[PDB]
RNA sequence: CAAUCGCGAGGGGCUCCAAGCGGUCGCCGGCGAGCACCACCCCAGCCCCGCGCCGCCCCCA
């Protein structure tokens, strides 16, 4: 419960560990106050979030060096959060338990190794059942190979058409299908049950389209039940759409954003919702304090945070907590900072 | 014929002399359990326990368990011919040339279809479905049924009237099983290659090089690890997508719009404040 | 010597149905260098060789009646519309050219639209409905159009050529369904059924090793018969799957044609072994036959 | 309607707006209807795009006349917002004109682009 | 790098020498980088294919 125009954020003490590369991915645990930090310097860190800790607040649980990979993305798996799947640019990806301590190397996606020469651009569904990989072959299109993580086996494929393929995609919050931001302005509301596209619709004026997030409650249950979608472009404009206004299954081919966000001038590189569906933090990594924060459903940018003097750095990754009360920002030099949010 | 446990961490292998259980997590054999020959099958008990069911080549029904050595004393010989085939359900049924349950050609094998029961009998080219190419092996999945038959050649016919040819093997097939959620058809062969039939978008991807040994494969109780029986007297619990053996067994409103409510018609000649209030509250 | 086009007169009494073949000399032969031929019913056949002329053929005269031509370049495909008539003929230069079949005359009517890239050579067409067209391309794209307005519906772009060498997926054959979907038989061996309401793909069945040059559907939308640059044809049944594949043929298979009438539901294939070869539709029924 | 050189959304619009953006980065770009009109009347213009998403399209219908007089190719894209952030303006650009110089790879891209526009008209 | 093996310009009568250059097995050899040798576009070039001019040779004249 927080009002639209002025936020009660505050600086919690930062993470002690510093990385030798930029922070490529952050992820909070979905059950516990645990931060997973992961950089291009081959190292992941787990930190427990206790601000009254001693000797060093926000202490370190463990520090995993993964050999020879540069960690592009690490992610918790499931609502329980018992696995961490992580991947660099290399042709394999690991999964790791949190209940048994098993590192497994998935090195073969099942007859699609020609189709995949990375594993870096993956997502895992909110129900934890499935996990989509961007297949790294374009020639005028882009496909998502869907993995069953209970077996780690390919079961489905999610090709859309564009120039340079998929920009960025998001699982439906029910888990029953996808929504895929391509690189021409086409956004595909894909369905997993029918394994077919529900409908293709265009962003408002996107040249390229760079990133994409999704989330909220009380949305279209035939489109996964998640309410808001934000799509960011090469021009730094973030368009925010209510997904209840894609239905007229007949998807509106030219819908209107609920709000055009035009504050940032350079290419939107991060976008995230708070998992209660009340905040949208988006930003760029080509200017210094290029991080903005948006109240939803009202679609207003908060004007008091950040300031001139908020230490952010060139923001490479952000992450909201499981209770939507701690924000994490990791930058181009390798330092996580944390902010509690009150409401 | 090898079989897992209900809690996945125990593998179960019959030899030509005894029954040996194994740790899927850590080590080799746990129990040498006595089982003389003075072997047809061994499955688990279905409804309440997980004891065992072993049938020898003639009628001697061993009802024997792990977590003990109990059951080394009680066979049963209710049937008169040498036992050929054997299947349990929940309720036991045994193929002798015909069934006894609780026909033209030579029998091969017999398998049982789950709780709303059905029976699948197997002669050479005949196959008997019961509601209530020359065969080598076959598996099945329910939910309303699908039957994958192998063959003495490398053709794997699939049935849900018309089969489907899934021919890969340059000899007999020795193993055909449905994978997990039914997406893949994991098959084996004489030529050491464990083929993963895609059965979706019709591709094939496999585990080629191995100890010249593939016959009698089995699938985990979950979608996880397949255990392989292996003709060099070896079993091999392989976790999935590793293909590495785990076990080897050998109200926001901008102020300027309210300023725009109060810009024109300065104090006098303004609309009355019922109307101006309707402008303001209509802005809010 | 080789087959390049097969077509049946009808596909549904003593009603004169005939079979029209195109032999790679330039010949045409009818059973009870040319490149394509169709019939029209409301019944006369139209053919193209590699040149831009699209010509009718009078049968009782056995002479090339009523040639047609145009400006653009080499016709590589053409086809006639269904009913709720014209011809649509796609070429090398990216034009698709409408010809008029007003009551008896074959006219160069109109060029509706054309791709911006000149390097998009069309290969085949099929008609998803009455007034809207599906065309394969020499790039990975297959593309829909409307001839009410000429407009350019959704590019249905295939991938890259993964298996080695080239980049472009050259889509050799495109056919349609009574369900409303369309099969695209591309290069690199694969087939893929694309959905019809949203014009996206729904299934990518990899069967062949080399490029499927021709395919044809049943008249009830039940059996799909592919035929490739291998020696190989393959059948497909219900979203789909294949059943089997037997090398009926000896060279690549170049042209299919199906018929489902008179108690004789056969599909005839021809390629470059100079031997036309006829199949049933009931492929578990009995054997096949061949004719030369 | 009056948009008879309508550019097709299958990537011809995308190559138009991309060349708009690259000419915007080479400063070869006259933005808006009035400055477009000045570039066509002065004859500096090498190609000109309009927007068919104009709410009254009469306010950009005047430049196809003088583009027919100066013999420069014009073509319509269906979104003035896509043209607007294709330019990089933060407002809606309704009609854009893009010139050339003696030697640039951009001038080569203009040449191939109005070759495609000539394939339309 | 270490063991090992091969060919052979060039010169001399199947043999002889040699400039050189590669392969295999071990490297508790070291260095460098990992989508991307890709996507979008443009300018050329190798090759293969089309069509018409010349350069030459012809035969009558």
């Amino acid at each position: 419960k927080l009002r639209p125009e002025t936020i009660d954020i505050q600086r919690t003490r930062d993470i002690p560990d510093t990385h030798k590369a930029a922070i490529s991915s952050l992820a909070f645990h979905p059950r516990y106050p645990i931060l997973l930090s992961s950089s291009t310097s081959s190292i992941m860190y787990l930190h427990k979030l206790d601000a009254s800790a001693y000797p060093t607040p926000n202490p370190l649980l463990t520090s995993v060096h993964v050999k020879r990979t540069d960690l592009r993305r690490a992610a918790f798996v499931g609502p329980d959060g018992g696995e961490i799947i992580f991947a660099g640019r290399r042709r394999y990806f690991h999964c790791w338990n949190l209940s048994s301590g098993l590192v497994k190397k998935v090195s073969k996606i099942q007859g699609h190794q020609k189709e995949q020469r990375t594993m870096e651009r993956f997502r895992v569904s909110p129900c934890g059942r499935y996990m989509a990989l961007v297949a790294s072959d374009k020639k005028g299109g882009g496909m998502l190979n869907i993995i069953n993580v209970g077996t780690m086996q390919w079961i489905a494929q999610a090709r859309i058409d564009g120039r340079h393929g998929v920009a960025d995609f998001a699982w439906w919050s029910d888990g029953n299908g996808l929504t895929i931001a391509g690189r021409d302005g086409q956004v595909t509301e894909w369905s997993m049950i029918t394994r077919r596209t529900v409908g293709i619709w265009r962003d408002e004026g996107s040249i390229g389209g760079t990133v994409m997030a999704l989330g909220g409650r009380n949305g279209p249950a035939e489109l996964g039940g998640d309410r808001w979608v934000a799509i960011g472009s090469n021009s730094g404009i973030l368009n925010v759409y209510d997904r209840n206004d894609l239905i007229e299954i007949r998807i509106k081919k030219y819908p209107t954003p609920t709000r055009v966000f035009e504050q940032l001038t350079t290419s939107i590189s991060v976008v995230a919702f708070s998992p209660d569906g009340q905040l949208l933090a988006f930003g760029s990594q080509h200017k210094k304090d290029a991080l903005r924060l948006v109240h939803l459903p009202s679609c207003t940018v908060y004007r008091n945070w950040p300031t001139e003097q908020t230490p952010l750095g060139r923001v490479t990754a952000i992450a909201f907590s499981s209770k939507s009360d701690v924000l994490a920002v990791g930058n181009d030099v390798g330092r996580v900072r944390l902010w509690e949010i009150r409401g | 014929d090898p079989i897992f446990s209900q809690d996945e961490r125990h593998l179960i292998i019959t030899y030509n002399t005894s029954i040996q259980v194994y740790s899927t997590e850590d080590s080799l054999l746990v129990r040498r359990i006595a089982l003389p020959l003075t072997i047809v099958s061994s499955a688990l008990s279905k409804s309440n326990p997980d004891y065992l069911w072993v049938a020898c080549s003639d009628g001697r029904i061993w009802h024997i368990n792990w977590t003990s050595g109990e059951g080394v004393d009680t066979p049963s010989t209710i049937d008169t011919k040498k036992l050929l085939d054997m299947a349990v359900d929940a309720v036991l049924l045994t193929l002798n040339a015909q069934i006894i349950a609780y026909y033209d050609e030579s029998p091969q094998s017999l398998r049982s279809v789950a709780g709303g029961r059905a029976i699948v009998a197997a002669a050479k080219e005949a196959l008997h479905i019961g509601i209530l190419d020359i065969i080598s092996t076959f598996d099945i999945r329910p939910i309303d049924i699908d039957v994958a038959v192998g063959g003495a050649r490398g053709a794997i016919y699939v049935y849900s009237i018309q089969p489907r040819k899934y021919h890969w093997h340059r000899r007999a097939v020795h193993s055909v099983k449905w994978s997990g959620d039914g997406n893949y058809l994991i098959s084996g062969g004489y030529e050491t290659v464990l083929v993963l039939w895609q059965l979706d978008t019709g591709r094939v991807d496999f585990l080629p090089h191995l100890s010249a040994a593939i016959e009698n494969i089995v699938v985990s109780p979950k979608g996880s690890a397949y255990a392989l029986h292996l003709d060099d007297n070896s079993a091999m619990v392989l976790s999935t997508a590793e293909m590495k053996p785990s076990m080897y067994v050998s109200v926001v409103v901008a102020p300027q719009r309210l300023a725009e409510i109060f810009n024109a018609a300065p104090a006098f000649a303004m609309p009355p404040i019922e109307d101006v209030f309707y402008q303001v509250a209509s802005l809010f | 010597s080789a087959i390049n086009a097969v077509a049946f007169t009808h596909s549904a009494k003593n009603i004169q149905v005939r079979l029209a073949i195109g032999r790679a000399n330039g010949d045409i032969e009818i059973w009870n260098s040319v490149d394509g031929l169709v019939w029209v019913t409301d019944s006369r056949l139209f053919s193209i060789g590699y040149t831009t002329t699209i010509t009718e053929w009078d049968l009782e005269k056995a002479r090339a009646k009523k040639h047609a031509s145009g400006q653009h370049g080499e016709i590589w495909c053409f086809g006639v519309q269904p009913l709720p008539r014209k011809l649509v003929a796609g070429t090398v230069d990216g034009n698709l050219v409408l010809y008029s079949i007003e009551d008896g005359d074959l006219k160069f009517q109109k060029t509706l639209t054309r791709t911006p890239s000149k390097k998009t050579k069309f290969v085949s067409i099929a008609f998803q409905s009455h007034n809207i067209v599906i065309v394969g391309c020499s790039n990975s794209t297959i593309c829909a159009y409307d001839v009410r307005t000429g407009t350019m519906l959704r590019q249905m772009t295939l991938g890259t050529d993964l298996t080695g060498g080239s980049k472009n997926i050259i889509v050799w054959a495109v056919k349609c369904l009574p369900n409303g979907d369309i099969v695209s038989g591309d290069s690199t061996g694969q087939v893929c059924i694309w959905d019809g309401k949203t014009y996206t793909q729904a299934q990518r069945i990899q069967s062949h090793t080399q490029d499927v040059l021709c395919l044809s559907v049943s008249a009830d939308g039940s059996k799909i018969i592919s035929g490739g640059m291998d020696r190989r044809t393959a059948v497909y049944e219900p979203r789909w799957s294949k059943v089997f594949h037997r090398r009926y043929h000896q060279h690549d298979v170049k042209a299919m044609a199906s018929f489902e009438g008179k108690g004789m539901s056969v599909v005839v294939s021809g390629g470059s072994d100079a031997s036309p070869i006829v199949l049933p539709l009931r492929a578990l029924g009995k054997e096949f036959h061949r004719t030369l | 309607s009056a948009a008879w050189p309508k550019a097709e959304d299958p990537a011809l619009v995308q190559e138009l707006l991309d060349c708009v953006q690259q000419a915007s980065h080479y400063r070869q770009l006259k933005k808006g209807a009035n400055e477009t009109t000045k570039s066509v009347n002065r004859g500096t213009s090498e190609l000109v795009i309009l927007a068919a998403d104009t709410q009254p399209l009469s306010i950009v219908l005047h430049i196809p006349l003088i583009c027919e007089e100066k013999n420069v190719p014009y073509v319509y894209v269906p979104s003035k917002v896509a043209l607007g952030r294709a330019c990089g303006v933060s407002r809606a650009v309704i009609a854009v004109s893009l010139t050339s110089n003696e030697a640039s790879d951009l001038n080569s891209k203009i040449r191939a682009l109005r070759d495609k526009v000539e394939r339309l008209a």
Side-chain angles (χ1 to χ4, degrees), chain A residues 1-4 6-7 9-13 15-16 18-49 51-79 81-114 116-119 121-160 162-167 169-173 175-188 190-202 204-225 227-241 243-247 249-331 333-339 341-343, chain B residues 2-24 27-132 134-138 140-143 145 147-152 154-180 182 184-190 192-199 201-204 206-214 216-221 223-230 233-259 261-273 276-284, chain C residues 1-26 28 30-31 33-41 43-55 57 59-92 94-101 104 106-145 147-160 162-180 182-185 187-194 196-210 212-219 221-229 231-236 238-251 253-259 261-272 274-286 288-292, chain D residues 1-7 10-14 16-17 19-45 47-52 54-67 70-101 103-114 116-117 119-121:
Chain A
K1 183 253 178 63
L2 70 162
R3 70 180 182 274
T6 298
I7 193 168
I9 197 168
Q10 69 185 3
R11 181 75 170 88
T12 313
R13 292 186 184 273
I15 291 300
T18 309
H19 300 180
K20 300 288 105 175
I23 296 164
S24 67
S25 178
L26 296 172
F28 282 95
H29 195 275
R31 293 293 94 195
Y32 294 102
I34 298 168
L35 186 65
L36 174 63
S37 187
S38 63
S39 291
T40 314
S41 67
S42 297
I43 296 172
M44 295 163 67
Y45 289 101
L46 289 171
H47 287 90
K48 185 172 70 67
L49 268 70
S52 68
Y54 183 76
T56 300
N58 292 319
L60 189 146
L61 296 177
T62 186
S63 69
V64 175
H65 174 78
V66 181
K67 188 172 175 65
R68 180 181 164 272
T69 65
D70 48 345
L71 271 307
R72 299 290 183 180
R73 186 174 293 174
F76 293 102
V77 171
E83 293 180 354
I84 295 170
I85 293 175
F86 55 88
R89 192 174 287 171
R90 273 69 173 169
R91 295 182 183 180
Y92 55 89
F93 67 97
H94 294 93
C95 180
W96 173 51
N97 285 320
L98 290 171
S99 177
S100 71
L102 181 64
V103 173
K104 60 178 76 67
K105 183 178 78 173
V106 180
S107 177
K108 180 178 174 65
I109 305 301
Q110 198 61 35
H112 295 281
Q113 290 295 108
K114 292 180 182 290
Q116 286 183 349
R117 297 183 69 250
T118 58
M119 300 297 171
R121 294 179 179 95
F122 65 97
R123 300 288 184 184
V124 181
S125 68
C127 63
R129 292 179 293 173
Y130 305 115
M131 170 260 188
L133 292 162
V134 171
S136 69
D137 283 321
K138 296 174 259 72
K139 195 59 177 176
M143 68 286 282
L144 294 169
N145 288 319
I146 289 93
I147 305 301
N148 194 2
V149 291
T151 73
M152 297 292 176
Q153 284 173 348
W154 179 75
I155 64 173
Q157 194 176 2
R159 181 171 175 86
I160 72 167
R163 286 174 74 192
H164 311 285
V166 177
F169 64 98
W171 290 93
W172 288 353
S173 66
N176 294 321
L178 277 74
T179 306
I180 304 166
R183 289 176 65 90
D184 58 350
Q186 296 182 358
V187 178
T188 296
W190 191 70
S191 179
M192 188 66 208
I193 297 170
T194 66
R195 200 180 288 115
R196 288 174 68 188
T197 292
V198 166
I200 302 170
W201 61 272
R202 291 182 184 270
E204 195 189 14
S206 176
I207 308 164
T210 306
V211 289
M212 175 183 172
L214 186 150
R217 294 188 291 115
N218 294 320
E222 62 185 2
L223 271 67
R227 183 180 175 90
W228 296 104
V229 58
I231 298 164
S233 62
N234 293 325
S235 66
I237 292 172
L238 183 74
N239 290 316
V240 171
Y241 299 90
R243 298 174 74 251
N244 289 319
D245 293 331
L246 297 179
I247 301 298
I249 301 170
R250 295 181 64 85
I251 300 298
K252 287 177 94 288
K253 285 175 91 287
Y254 294 96
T256 306
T258 300
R259 185 172 170 86
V260 168
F261 289 105
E262 62 189 4
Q263 290 90 18
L264 297 180
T265 65
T266 59
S267 175
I268 301 296
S269 297
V270 295
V271 60
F273 286 169
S274 67
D276 61 350
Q278 287 177 354
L279 286 175
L280 159 54
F282 67 101
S284 176
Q285 49 177 346
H286 303 90
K287 290 180 74 68
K288 184 65 69 71
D289 292 341
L291 182 72
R292 296 295 185 273
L293 187 54
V294 170
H295 183 267
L296 297 173
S298 67
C299 295
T300 312
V301 177
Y302 294 104
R303 65 175 296 172
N304 58 350
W305 187 82
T307 64
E308 292 184 355
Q309 57 186 3
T310 297
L312 287 167
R314 293 182 299 277
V315 178
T316 64
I318 58 173
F320 286 97
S321 67
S322 67
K323 288 175 67 178
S324 300
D325 287 330
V326 171
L327 178 64
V329 174
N331 54 3
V333 296
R335 182 175 175 85
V336 184
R337 293 180 181 91
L338 301 175
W339 288 268
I341 302 168
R342 292 181 62 89
Chain B
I3 190 68
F4 290 88
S5 176
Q6 182 63 257
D7 292 331
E8 193 176 0
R9 63 186 186 275
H10 292 91
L11 184 62
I12 296 152
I13 301 170
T14 58
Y15 293 98
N16 210 165
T17 183
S18 179
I19 172 65
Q20 300 292 323
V21 299
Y22 290 90
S23 300
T24 313
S27 175
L28 276 76
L29 59 89
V30 177
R31 289 177 183 88
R32 292 182 66 189
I33 303 169
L35 189 62
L37 288 175
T38 300
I39 302 298
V40 168
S41 293
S42 74
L44 264 70
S45 182
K46 184 70 181 295
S47 181
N48 195 3
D50 53 355
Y51 287 162
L52 201 55
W53 289 100
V54 182
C56 296
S57 179
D58 53 354
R60 293 178 72 190
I61 299 170
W62 296 97
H63 186 266
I64 190 167
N65 57 358
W66 61 91
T67 328
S68 178
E70 183 180 1
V72 294
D73 289 330
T74 59
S76 296
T77 175
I78 199 68
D79 296 328
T80 178
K81 188 60 72 176
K82 294 188 284 185
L83 302 182
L84 280 83
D85 293 314
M86 180 68 194
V88 301
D89 200 359
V91 180
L92 190 151
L93 49 90
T94 297
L95 182 65
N96 289 318
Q98 290 185 0
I99 192 64
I100 188 165
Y102 61 97
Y103 193 83
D104 52 354
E105 209 181 5
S106 65
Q108 297 291 313
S109 59
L110 172 71
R111 289 178 65 88
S112 177
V113 186
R117 296 182 180 94
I119 58 168
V120 176
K124 296 290 191 182
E125 291 89 4
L127 190 146
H128 296 88
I129 297 298
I131 198 169
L132 55 90
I134 294 96
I135 200 165
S136 177
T137 184
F138 65 100
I140 198 165
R141 64 181 295 273
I143 296 170
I145 193 170
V147 174
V149 175
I156 303 167
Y157 296 158
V158 179
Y159 293 98
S160 174
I161 184 169
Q162 188 172 6
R164 288 181 289 170
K165 286 186 182 177
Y166 287 158
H167 200 287
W168 183 77
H169 295 89
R170 184 62 74 183
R171 273 174 76 178
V173 297
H174 297 280
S175 291
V176 169
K177 275 177 183 173
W178 293 93
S179 80
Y184 295 89
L185 186 66
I186 177 68
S187 174
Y190 179 74
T192 204
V193 178
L194 179 66
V195 289
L196 281 163
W197 291 99
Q198 180 70 49
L199 177 62
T201 69
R203 294 182 178 91
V204 58
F206 46 87
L207 180 63
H209 294 288
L210 194 52
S211 68
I214 291 296
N216 190 4
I217 72 168
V218 291
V219 180
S220 72
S224 295
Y226 306 107
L228 305 183
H229 187 272
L230 292 177
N233 195 3
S234 294
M236 189 176 179
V237 174
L238 291 169
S239 62
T240 316
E242 288 291 318
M243 296 298 108
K244 181 71 179 70
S246 176
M247 281 303 164
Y248 184 73
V249 169
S250 180
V251 174
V252 165
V253 164
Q256 310 189 4
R257 292 182 175 93
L258 193 139
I261 293 171
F262 294 107
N263 275 320
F268 61 97
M270 186 175 282
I273 53 168
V276 182
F277 168 66
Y278 291 154
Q279 295 175 358
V280 167
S282 70
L283 181 60
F284 289 159
Chain C
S1 179
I3 312 293
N4 286 323
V6 196
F8 282 106
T9 298
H10 294 86
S11 184
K13 291 189 284 185
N14 67 17
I15 304 300
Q16 184 177 1
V17 62
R18 291 294 181 269
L19 183 63
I21 213 88
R23 298 291 299 271
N25 297 318
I28 290 171
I30 295 163
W31 288 276
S33 177
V34 294
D35 186 71
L37 51 88
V38 307
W39 290 94
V40 73
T41 298
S43 176
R44 67 182 178 177
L45 73 93
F46 296 146
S47 71
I48 58 100
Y50 285 169
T51 185
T52 185
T53 67
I54 180 162
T55 174
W57 291 88
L59 274 70
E60 290 182 352
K61 187 179 178 181
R63 192 180 290 271
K65 179 179 76 72
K66 291 181 74 67
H67 295 281
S69 178
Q71 179 75 52
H72 51 281
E74 298 185 357
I75 293 298
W76 277 0
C77 58
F78 67 100
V80 70
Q81 291 182 355
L83 273 73
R85 291 183 180 274
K86 288 180 183 179
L87 287 173
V88 177
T91 185
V92 171
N95 292 313
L96 57 89
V97 176
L98 263 64
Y99 292 95
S100 179
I101 191 177
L106 181 62
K107 297 181 175 69
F108 179 80
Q109 181 177 1
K110 187 183 287 186
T111 301
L112 284 179
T113 46
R114 62 183 67 87
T115 57
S117 299
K118 190 173 69 66
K119 303 294 182 180
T120 59
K121 301 179 286 291
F122 303 133
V123 174
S124 66
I125 66 165
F127 288 167
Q128 165 73 49
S129 292
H130 173 74
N131 50 2
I132 47 103
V133 182
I134 312 300
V135 191
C137 293
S138 176
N139 296 118
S140 61
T141 61
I142 72 104
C143 51
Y145 292 97
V147 302
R148 297 289 186 183
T149 59
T151 191
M152 184 174 182
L153 272 76
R154 181 173 174 83
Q155 297 301 111
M156 288 169 271
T157 307
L158 288 165
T160 184
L162 291 174
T163 183
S166 63
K167 294 180 177 69
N168 283 316
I169 298 297
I170 301 166
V171 180
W172 295 103
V174 177
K175 293 295 181 184
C176 181
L177 271 70
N179 193 3
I182 51 102
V183 183
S184 65
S187 293
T188 196
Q190 70 178 1
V191 305
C192 57
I193 163 173
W194 299 82
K197 277 80 174 176
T198 62
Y199 296 99
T200 188
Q201 75 179 0
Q203 178 73 250
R204 182 185 284 179
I205 299 168
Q206 178 70 42
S207 174
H208 293 77
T209 307
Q210 294 177 352
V212 281
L213 296 173
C214 60
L215 60 93
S216 291
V217 298
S218 63
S222 63
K223 292 181 182 291
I224 305 97
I225 319 294
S226 291
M229 192 172 283
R231 298 173 187 266
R232 185 176 294 116
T233 73
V235 301
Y236 298 93
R239 296 292 181 186
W240 285 348
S241 176
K242 71 182 288 182
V243 178
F244 66 98
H245 58 284
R246 177 164 66 187
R247 291 178 181 174
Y248 295 103
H249 202 265
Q250 190 176 0
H251 201 267
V253 184
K254 291 184 182 294
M256 306 305 296
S258 65
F259 182 75
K262 291 184 183 293
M264 182 181 70
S265 297
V266 297
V267 50
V268 51
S269 62
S272 183
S275 296
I277 172 163
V278 294
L279 304 172
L281 284 179
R282 50 180 78 90
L284 289 185
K286 290 299 294 297
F288 64 97
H289 182 67
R290 64 173 65 85
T291 302
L292 175 60
Chain D
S1 178
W4 66 272
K6 178 61 67 68
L12 191 278
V13 174
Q14 183 62 255
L16 281 170
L17 297 174
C19 190
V20 165
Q21 191 182 8
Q22 187 174 3
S24 178
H25 292 170
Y26 288 167
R27 298 291 294 163
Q28 298 297 109
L29 195 72
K30 302 295 187 291
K31 299 175 286 293
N34 293 318
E35 190 178 5
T36 295
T37 311
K38 294 172 187 179
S39 65
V40 174
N41 283 320
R42 289 183 63 196
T44 63
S45 178
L47 196 155
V48 46
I49 302 104
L50 284 76
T54 302
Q55 186 66 41
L57 82 160
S58 173
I59 69 173
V60 295
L61 279 172
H62 72 106
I63 43 177
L65 281 170
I66 57 171
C67 290
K70 298 291 183 181
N71 291 318
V72 293
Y74 65 100
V75 61
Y76 295 11
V77 294
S79 179
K80 66 184 178 67
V81 182
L83 188 61
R85 73 186 70 183
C87 294
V89 159
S90 65
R91 298 294 292 165
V93 176
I94 201 170
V96 79
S97 173
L98 71 175
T99 69
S100 295
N101 295 117
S104 69
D105 200 5
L106 184 65
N107 195 2
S108 297
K109 294 182 183 294
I110 299 302
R111 186 176 66 242
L113 186 58
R114 63 183 174 179
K116 296 179 181 179
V117 176
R119 287 177 61 86
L120 288 175

